[PDB]
Design a protein around this motif. Sequence first.
Motif, short mmCIF file in Angstrom:
data_model
loop_
_atom_site.label_atom_id
_atom_site.label_comp_id
_atom_site.label_asym_id
_atom_site.label_seq_id
_atom_site.Cartn_x
_atom_site.Cartn_y
_atom_site.Cartn_z
N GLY B 29 0.86 -1.19 0.00
CA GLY B 29 0.00 0.00 0.00
C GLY B 29 0.88 1.22 0.00
O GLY B 29 2.07 1.13 -0.34
N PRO B 30 0.32 2.38 0.36
CA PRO B 30 -1.10 2.60 0.65
C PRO B 30 -1.96 2.36 -0.59
O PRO B 30 -1.48 2.53 -1.71
CB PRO B 30 -1.17 4.08 1.01
CG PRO B 30 0.10 4.70 0.39
CD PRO B 30 1.13 3.61 0.41
N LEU B 31 -3.22 1.97 -0.37
CA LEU B 31 -4.18 1.75 -1.44
C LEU B 31 -5.17 2.91 -1.54
O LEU B 31 -5.71 3.37 -0.54
CB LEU B 31 -4.94 0.43 -1.21
CG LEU B 31 -4.06 -0.80 -0.92
CD1 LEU B 31 -4.87 -2.07 -0.51
CD2 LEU B 31 -3.13 -1.07 -2.09
N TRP B 32 -5.44 3.34 -2.76
CA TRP B 32 -6.30 4.48 -2.96
C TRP B 32 -7.41 4.08 -3.87
O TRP B 32 -7.19 3.44 -4.89
CB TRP B 32 -5.53 5.60 -3.65
CG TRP B 32 -4.25 5.95 -3.01
CD1 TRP B 32 -3.01 5.75 -3.50
CD2 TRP B 32 -4.09 6.63 -1.77
NE1 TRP B 32 -2.06 6.25 -2.65
CE2 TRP B 32 -2.70 6.81 -1.57
CE3 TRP B 32 -4.99 7.14 -0.82
CZ2 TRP B 32 -2.17 7.45 -0.43
CZ3 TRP B 32 -4.48 7.77 0.30
CH2 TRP B 32 -3.07 7.90 0.51
N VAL B 33 -8.61 4.47 -3.50
CA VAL B 33 -9.76 4.20 -4.33
C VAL B 33 -10.41 5.54 -4.52
O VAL B 33 -10.72 6.20 -3.53
CB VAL B 33 -10.72 3.20 -3.68
CG1 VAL B 33 -11.96 2.94 -4.57
CG2 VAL B 33 -9.98 1.87 -3.38
N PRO B 34 -10.57 5.97 -5.78
CA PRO B 34 -11.26 7.22 -6.04
C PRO B 34 -12.74 7.07 -5.70
O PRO B 34 -13.32 6.01 -5.93
CB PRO B 34 -11.07 7.44 -7.55
CG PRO B 34 -10.01 6.41 -8.00
CD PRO B 34 -10.16 5.28 -7.03
N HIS B 35 -13.34 8.13 -5.13
CA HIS B 35 -14.80 8.23 -4.91
C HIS B 35 -15.66 7.76 -6.08
O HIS B 35 -16.64 7.02 -5.85
CB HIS B 35 -15.19 9.68 -4.57
CG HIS B 35 -15.20 10.59 -5.77
ND1 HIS B 35 -14.05 10.90 -6.48
CD2 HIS B 35 -16.21 11.25 -6.39
CE1 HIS B 35 -14.36 11.71 -7.48
NE2 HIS B 35 -15.67 11.94 -7.44
N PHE B 36 -15.32 8.18 -7.31
CA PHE B 36 -16.10 7.75 -8.49
C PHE B 36 -16.06 6.24 -8.72
O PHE B 36 -16.98 5.68 -9.31
CB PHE B 36 -15.73 8.54 -9.79
CG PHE B 36 -14.32 8.27 -10.31
CD1 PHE B 36 -14.06 7.16 -11.11
CD2 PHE B 36 -13.27 9.14 -10.02
CE1 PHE B 36 -12.73 6.91 -11.60
CE2 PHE B 36 -11.95 8.89 -10.50
CZ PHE B 36 -11.70 7.77 -11.28
#
Lengths: 130, 131
Positions: B29-36
């Motif tokens: 990580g870090p892991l990121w996920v966009p809101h969309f």
Amino acid sequence: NAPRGGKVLDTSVLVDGRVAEVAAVGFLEGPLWVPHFVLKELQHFADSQDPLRRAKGRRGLETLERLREAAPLEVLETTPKGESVDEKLLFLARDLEAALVTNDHALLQMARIYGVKALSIQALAQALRP
Amino acid sequence: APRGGKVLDTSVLVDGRVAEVAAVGFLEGPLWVPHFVLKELQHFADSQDPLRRAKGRRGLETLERLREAAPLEVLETTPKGESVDEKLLFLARDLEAALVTNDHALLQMARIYGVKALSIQALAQALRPQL
């Protein structure tokens, strides 16, 4: 404990060879460290008149060469703590805050008991099987 | 080279295997996920069509498993880019993260934009036994 200090590689994973392709494809973040004794082991195998042991010491080394493409790879001459190979790898991984990378069943067990993160190529492979 | 983590798109979540990869230690990580991406999975799960629902559930299910394997943050505003592709690419660049995707064409787009991108399908191929 989630180690950003890279990866300490053992003989089994270098002999297996696939760690090299996993790195190149971006899923083995460095720095990559190999102990002097691992290399000492791959050439003690390479120095065999027995073709089988020769062709696997030979194989470990090619994997090293190919890793030195995907990522900075550096040999550790400096190993002070531990008597067995498995014991030295473990304190090595704690010292650098790096994960072990190994297929070795006994070493994977010792690491769970020590609480050292250890990555298994075979466990990766069996997760991605069709 | 990117030391800033891993941006996950919709397709990689729906594929699900990235959850297997993280739970064995090979998705750092870090892991990121966009809101969309999260919004889109929710829109799938809420769909009338049972197959859109299954993709939505599978991606939501994958997201929960990842949140267990490592630290994961939903990033709740993007301004860089016009299409979904561009948004994902510029975000990964901004974070100095790698993009992780199942989408073949997006992998090629990342090459064009000079953004590091990782393929679960290329990983599965690397894992063919050798020698």
